[PDB]
Symmetry: C3
Subunit: 205 residues, 3 copies
Amino acid sequence: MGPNPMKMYPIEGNKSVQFIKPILEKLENVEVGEYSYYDSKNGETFDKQILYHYPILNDKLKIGKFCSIGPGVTIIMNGANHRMDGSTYPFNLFGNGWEKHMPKLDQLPIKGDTIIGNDVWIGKDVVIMPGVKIGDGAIVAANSVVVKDIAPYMLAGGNPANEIKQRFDQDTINQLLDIKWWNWPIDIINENIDKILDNSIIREV
Amino acid sequence: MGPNPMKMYPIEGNKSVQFIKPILEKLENVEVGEYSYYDSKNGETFDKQILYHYPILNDKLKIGKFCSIGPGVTIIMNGANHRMDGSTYPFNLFGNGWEKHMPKLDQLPIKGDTIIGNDVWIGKDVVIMPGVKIGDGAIVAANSVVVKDIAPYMLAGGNPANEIKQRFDQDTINQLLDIKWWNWPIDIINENIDKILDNSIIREVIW
Amino acid sequence: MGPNPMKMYPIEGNKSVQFIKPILEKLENVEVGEYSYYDSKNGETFDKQILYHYPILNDKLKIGKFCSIGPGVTIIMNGANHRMDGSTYPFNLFGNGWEKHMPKLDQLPIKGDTIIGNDVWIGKDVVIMPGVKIGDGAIVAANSVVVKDIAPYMLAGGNPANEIKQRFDQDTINQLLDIKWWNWPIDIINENIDKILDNSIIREVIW
């Protein structure tokens, strides 16, 4: 019951809704969760949505399970950070004698890994900046520019994106982070979808 | 005198500027004013800029007259709101048995309809969110994201968009909201464009 | 040593990165510095990134030297401002008798010249509005919408962009502003690229 999480394109006949895991497996420094899908903008594959990601830099991108990524969402890793101790001008880029002035890896600023929780909804055209972490259950409004962390089960938006409000009271939130239904076996989940959909799954747990 | 409001491309030999009524009118749950235009960004027709609008959700989009809509402006309707009382994951979308957990219309509430007033100037690449109302005379800055209502004759901007300032004093605005020149027959408007252009149209009618 | 600032495409076999100066020699009321470059988003030339620039209005765009313009940066000039003392509707635009209502230059808003300093790093998809000045050494974060001036050596971002942080303390900034290494004959620059890169240039030139 349910789609094949190994299938790149879960909906037969439809090449717009895609499962990220299959696609990003061929890539390094990227761990993706089962059932997270990307809703193509112009029929593009989610791998083009990840910019400036280089193995040599070693920063990682992690995405949880049951994530809904809207069309146009872009993820910016650290490969485009400029050295900022002095001038930001990439002299080395233009060779002809300038390559000699090339940064040492420890000279380029790395803001860290980018982590996206489970059951996270990212609206369309959302831009996510280097080294950000979006907690489980969070909802990132459309056209947001995420530059700082967002807390679990928080509704957020803007440029810079800011937390607007908690999706539920703290105890309801607290419990969901404990249950972690997204880590339940496919069959147990398939047997509680509706309780998970209306948050009533909390009571029986 | 003046263009034909029924023409899709008012300006001869020009496929960039379009009159929005001829185009949208052809659609469901949409009302548009006669002279409002759209300055195409890449040649697209304004109908391509209205996203997630589904008859079944029954939300309407209203656009007044004499509106200036910049290129790339995007209007988001309620067709893509995920259920939110629990998980936001669209299980039903992937069928294969998950289609039974499909939302019942009353589990997908909406804030309201989207209404853009008359004589509104919306800058380029502005994104308009569901259930928002923009007042007559308002000016929305380029690249703004409208998430809440904007009052009549206000200057607003940003992401989220915020009201920056009032365009005129309160009386000029209330007088204007009264006169509603955009509602006059074409012939009477043609006679005062300059007065409507410099706002002196208030002293002629009012006084 | 160092690239020829006159080459449109400095990096051999690579039509993505361009030196803005040679590429914009043709445009009017535009001044650009020698090593400023653009990082093309989809192959487009930078001249395509400057919008609503009409000589008639006479506003100018100035871009200093050694600037890093990220892909998709958009510079909006004054040719897009509507008349605002009354209706913002551009009747004159549709002709058919309406052209007569065409604005006299002095009736049209015009925020001034746009000025980008030296050694300025402008992030991806940044939109620069009209009449804005960006000080030397500033860094603009990707996706910002710059509506107001940005002081020298400041870190700014958002929509509207706000100054987030001073890169260095005031005296270091002032020294850098006084030294102006970007105005040095390239020979001298070439022998100090590394001191310019770690800021040790201040210590040697000031004391």
